Design an enzyme around this catalytic site. Structure first.
Site, PDB file in Angstrom:
ATOM      1  N   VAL A   1       0.831  -1.201   0.000  1.00 11.51           N
ATOM      2  CA  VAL A   1       0.000   0.000   0.000  1.00 11.51           C
ATOM      3  C   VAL A   1       0.867   1.253   0.000  1.00 11.51           C
ATOM      4  O   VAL A   1       1.256   1.754  -1.055  1.00 11.51           O
ATOM      5  CB  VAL A   1      -0.964   0.038   1.199  1.00 11.51           C
ATOM      6  CG1 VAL A   1      -2.408   0.054   0.722  1.00 11.51           C
ATOM      7  CG2 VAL A   1      -0.714  -1.141   2.123  1.00 11.51           C
ATOM      8  N   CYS A   2       1.180   1.738   1.192  1.00  6.31           N
ATOM      9  CA  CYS A   2       2.028   2.915   1.345  1.00  6.31           C
ATOM     10  C   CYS A   2       3.444   2.617   0.850  1.00  6.31           C
ATOM     11  O   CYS A   2       3.815   1.455   0.691  1.00  6.31           O
ATOM     12  CB  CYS A   2       2.062   3.351   2.814  1.00  6.31           C
ATOM     13  SG  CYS A   2       1.755   2.016   3.993  1.00  6.31           S
ATOM     14  N   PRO A   3       4.261   3.659   0.595  1.00  3.81           N
ATOM     15  CA  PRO A   3       5.634   3.483   0.106  1.00  3.81           C
ATOM     16  C   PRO A   3       6.596   3.026   1.202  1.00  3.81           C
ATOM     17  O   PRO A   3       7.814   3.100   1.040  1.00  3.81           O
ATOM     18  CB  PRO A   3       6.011   4.880  -0.385  1.00  3.81           C
ATOM     19  CG  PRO A   3       5.200   5.803   0.457  1.00  3.81           C
ATOM     20  CD  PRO A   3       3.906   5.087   0.739  1.00  3.81           C
ATOM     21  N   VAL A   4       6.043   2.545   2.311  1.00  2.00           N
ATOM     22  CA  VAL A   4       6.855   2.080   3.432  1.00  2.00           C
ATOM     23  C   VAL A   4       7.675   0.838   3.057  1.00  2.00           C
ATOM     24  O   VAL A   4       8.892   0.826   3.235  1.00  2.00           O
ATOM     25  CB  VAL A   4       5.993   1.773   4.674  1.00  2.00           C
ATOM     26  CG1 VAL A   4       6.871   1.574   5.901  1.00  2.00           C
ATOM     27  CG2 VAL A   4       4.978   2.883   4.908  1.00  2.00           C
ATOM     28  N   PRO A   5       7.029  -0.225   2.526  1.00  2.00           N
ATOM     29  CA  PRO A   5       7.733  -1.452   2.132  1.00  2.00           C
ATOM     30  C   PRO A   5       8.880  -1.173   1.168  1.00  2.00           C
ATOM     31  O   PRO A   5       9.878  -1.896   1.148  1.00  2.00           O
ATOM     32  CB  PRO A   5       6.651  -2.291   1.447  1.00  2.00           C
ATOM     33  CG  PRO A   5       5.367  -1.787   2.006  1.00  2.00           C
ATOM     34  CD  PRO A   5       5.578  -0.322   2.267  1.00  2.00           C
TER      35      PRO A   5
END
Length: 98
Positions: free
Chosen positions: A35-39
């Site tokens: 989802v978010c650009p965290v990974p």
């Protein structure tokens, strides 16, 4: 997580090695339904901050080892220990910082 009591899992040498081999893996990197650009920033830390004798897993639709090669090769060569597949575009790779 998974730790609750003493270590009584892989005690004796059980020859019940099914399809998936019980290798000495440390961590696992999964980037399936992101989802978010965290990974994204996560995997970056993997190559940017690799540990001596670490062992990680990779479960996605693309070979993350693409960037792994340039890194491990800078020092040694590659963190290649195991490679396999699951479905159409979904594959599984095993990496290990030597």
């Amino acid at each position: 997580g998974s730790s609750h009591h003493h270590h009584h899992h892989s005690s004796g040498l059980v020859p019940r090695g099914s399809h998936m081999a019980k290798y000495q893996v440390t961590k696992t990197l999964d980037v399936r339904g992101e989802v978010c650009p965290v990974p994204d920033v996560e995997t970056k830390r993997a190559l940017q901050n690799m540990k001596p004798g670490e062992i990680l897993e990779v479960w996605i639709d693309y070979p993350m080892s693409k960037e792994r090669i340039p890194e491990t090769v800078k020092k040694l060569g590659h963190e290649v220990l195991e490679i396999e597949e699951v479905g159409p575009s979904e594959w599984k790779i095993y990496i290990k910082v030597k």
